[model samples]
Target: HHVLDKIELFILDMDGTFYLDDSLLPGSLEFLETLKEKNKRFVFFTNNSSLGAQDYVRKLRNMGVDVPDDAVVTSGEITAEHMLKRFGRCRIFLLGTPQLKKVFEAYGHVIDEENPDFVVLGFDKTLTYERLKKACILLRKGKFYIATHPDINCPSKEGPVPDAGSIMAAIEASTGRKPDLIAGKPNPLVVDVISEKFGVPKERMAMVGDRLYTDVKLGKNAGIVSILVLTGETTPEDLERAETKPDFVFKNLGELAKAVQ
Candidate 1:
């Protein structure tokens, strides 16, 4: 109770935990309103690097949830943040959709497919054989490698598609190597950015989501409170069998809204 009561910010997942398939899960909006009523701040941090922050904002607008551009953070942005902080302005060989390219470019990182300082991979639906081979060759030549997230599959409007982890598999199989850093959920980098951006300490934040590994694991890795809701992908049975567990659980944001209030 003290933990929930003291939380000043909440880093939440987009799909499953908040909304499912473009529709806001019941009370998801109410949860946001409740947080605001309590003078609490929250942000939606999604692992889907296929789209940008504004892209997610546009998607959420269709559901009647209006938020600023910075409210939604993406793995692509996190990857760029890590890259810029460590390497400064550098050339990157990237494998991702066009929007991810814009994220990196917006960060002042150049996308050099030929000779790059680092080779980074995201959810590359626009993947091509030449680009994959080039990435393999660069890694074999000892270029630094990084991936946005470790999700093997990403849910799309139509169905699931190959994500960064799956694409990384292709690179590893070709180069016999893995990424040096995975910059999404379950990585401390996500928290570092959140704390820096939102002006909140890790101790005063909570991560709420429907999945165990990404959302809850992020909280565990970041030394923050982890909360799980059964509104999306996870079931009670799955949570019972899970190796990683949340600090708390709620049926949905509506129930959580009541508890926090």
Candidate 2:
């Protein structure tokens, strides 16, 4: 109950926590208003690497939540940061959309499909058998593998769809290898980038989302408060049996807004 009072920033998960599909969830606007009224900051953190930051900003604005580009962080950005920090200016074979390729190129990593130092995978909606075969071949030939996130399925209006983790599994079965590093929620690398960007310590931050594995686990992994809202993938029964528990649980972000001072 007193959790939000101590929190300076809320690191929110987009698909589940903020809004589902094109519809805004109950208390979504109220939550943002409350944060603004309290002089607290909030940032949108998504493991979905299918789109770029500007794209998300446009989507959020169209949905009536207007925030600057810096207010959004994606796994694509974190993956780019991870590659840049580790490999410097190396070449990579990126399996992603055109938007995601921009994310990597922005960080100074060259995208090379023919010859590559690393094979990076994302939620490539533009995927082709050619690209998949290329990725498998590269991995078989001993290229380092890195993934944007570990989410097996992504939430959609109709239902769940195959995501990055599912794609990773196919490649793993073919090449008998997994990602050397995954830069997304629960991985701590994205949190590190968020913490640095916001200049807020992990203690005063809250990772709010619906998933126990990614959102809540990120909080646990980073020593931050985790708040689970029941507006997305997780259920009450799911939370009961989860190995990881959130620091706080609410029916929705509206409930969270009411709890905040």
Candidate 3:
């Protein structure tokens, strides 16, 4: 049996696994077509919390690739679910964009900057010094903290740029405290969210990504198969020395597509 035979659901990472910059990677569309032909399912799950599902939908559509609204998932959505499940009806001091705040609000959670029960952070591209100062103050005053993801840097057309984890570092330095929970990749909570949402068991799913720490680690932690693609952040040397190894490795999704079909 092929390595992809055991998987019914493919939880795909976006930035590196499928595309980079404003362009789709080679054969990415073909890989998706193969998955469709095989009667398998795929979801574009991204650790970047800067954009919401609709934003991704718009972006993908602009790139001539269209998928249903539910086909895309972001760490921001996962973190919202985590907060609602663990701390219901809580107020949050959100260090995130307006889009992220909408995700929390849609779940019936309150977003209060001055007075809050928790301080939640996301990949806020619209970050301001005043917002950072406020977050540190609230954290120092003993408000609970959570981050959408732990990605230190996000890949871009320009280069690597500071992500939510980098923002977390500054807050940690000032407040001397880290987030109480990180509700994204590598956290089983996110895995659980995906499984529950799609009605697929974790054992029947595969986590595919370019990062070992987040994507591959999510698979390992959640008892799913981890498939690493070399189209992004990871390198052959990096993989050789890494503690978290993928169950299957491919040069790109094009190769993985051929293996399945």
Candidate 4:
């Protein structure tokens, strides 16, 4: 067996691993530059199912990251693709942002608030109580349930914000039915997609991110090595309470880049 000298594929989490809030974290540029210089394959993977692939391309480019449009993958895109394959064309009631709504629309899925075949939950940064009440009612009536990802909190400059899982929990508590599928990180479907797309063995790929439950747990669950960084949502205390252990933990991506180099 080859020693763990080079990681074949590097999958990054957007908000915390590469950046925090509106600003890129220390060493974000350097890390990407080094990866590019070495011609190491890398991609941005996010559980923030609030935006689609095209939106992320614009956002990352505006943030001074030169990632190609195809290099970025969003849970919104992944989740929509998953749902489309399952139901062909179903009416989906979404608890997500307008940007996320667009993803489903582009996939030829109809959005019907009045009569939905499924209730899909995601990170709705522009959330409202009215939307929650509506979703609760639908889920209570036994609509098929789905969650984009299981992340409860999203990393931000200020702190964690309510993510999709939190919303999914409330609906479950009220409706007494759990999500039928979760299409994002820590889900085998996502791991399978990453593996197939990059053709990297689960052992040789490293998933670097800030969240333990979503990022590190994905590795633990999928038999892939995971690296957690503290420059985002996770603090030392969070790690202490985490059930899943990471293969490696770093202060931030900059430090990780240096280590990789």
lDDT measured at residue 80 in model 1 versus the true structure, 0 to 100:
93
> What tens-digit string does per-residue lDDT give for candidate 4 at 1-261?
523346877888887778766679998888888787877777889888777888888888888888777788888888888888878887989888899999889899999999999998889877788988898898888889888888887666557777887876777787777788888888867777877877888777888888777787788777778888998778999999987778888898788778877
Ranking by lDDT: 2, 1, 3, 4
lDDT head-to-head 2 vs 4, winner: 2
Model 1 C-alpha lDDT per residue in residues 29-102, reported as the tens digit of each score: 89999998999999999888989989998899888998887889999999998888888987999998999999
Off by over 4 Å in 1: 156-160
Positional deviation of 207 in candidate 2, in angstroms? Answer: 0.4
Q: For this target, which candidate reaches the highest TM-score against the unseen true structure?
A: 1
lDDT of 2: 0.89
> What TM-score does candidate 4 get on C-alpha atoms?
0.88
What alpha-carbon RMSD in Å does predicted model 1 have with respect to the real structure?
Answer: 1.3
TM per candidate comes to 0.96, 0.95, 0.94, 0.88
Q: What is the C-alpha local distance difference test score of each model?
A: 0.88, 0.89, 0.87, 0.82
Runs of candidate 2 exceeding 4 Å displacement? none
Model 1 scores a TM of 0.96
Q: Count the backbone clashes (under 3 Å) in each candidate.
A: 0, 0, 0, 0
